[PDB]
Amino acid sequence: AVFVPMAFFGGSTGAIYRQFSITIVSAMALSVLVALILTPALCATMLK
């Protein structure tokens, strides 16, 4: 909600604030997919 509405671009600065969120916004949902899957698993399987 901070990044995606900032990426509603207007004019010749089209792929500037646009690519400045959607790029890193996919990385947010892939890190929440890496924190809901994967990280839970590796911590239980092998820690101390």
Binding site: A15, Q19, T23, A27, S31, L38, L42
Partner: protein, 150 residues
Amino acid sequence: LKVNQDGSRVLLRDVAKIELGGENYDIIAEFNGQPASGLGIKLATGANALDTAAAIRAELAKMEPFFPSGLKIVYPYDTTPFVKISIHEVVKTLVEAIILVFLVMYLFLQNFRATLIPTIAVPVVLLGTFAVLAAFGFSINTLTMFGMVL
């Protein structure tokens, strides 16, 4: 052109000089004060930039062997090496962000395995981002690679 009375022939060379020269003498280049020509290729408004410049060397490479004596290619004003530096000083910064994070995870937690879960977490997310930008439409721009560091 003509045949004057007495059987004399007026030819085109007799009335005018004939040399095989250029069609336009308005411009002439000089590479380091040396007689030269060139090929200033400009983009096609939406082209792939470096992929276009890679195929400029595709045609050029097959032309090289059939040159006369002396003819040699030289490379001024080039955009190609700037994108090679933007990949080699961002993926290098990518590795410097992982190694520096490795030291912070070891100081707070002495366990080697604890400085390993976050080390495999972020590279997996970095690759997943490439798959999203490929499926939607974007590319590996100067901007989207700076998004990987941020």
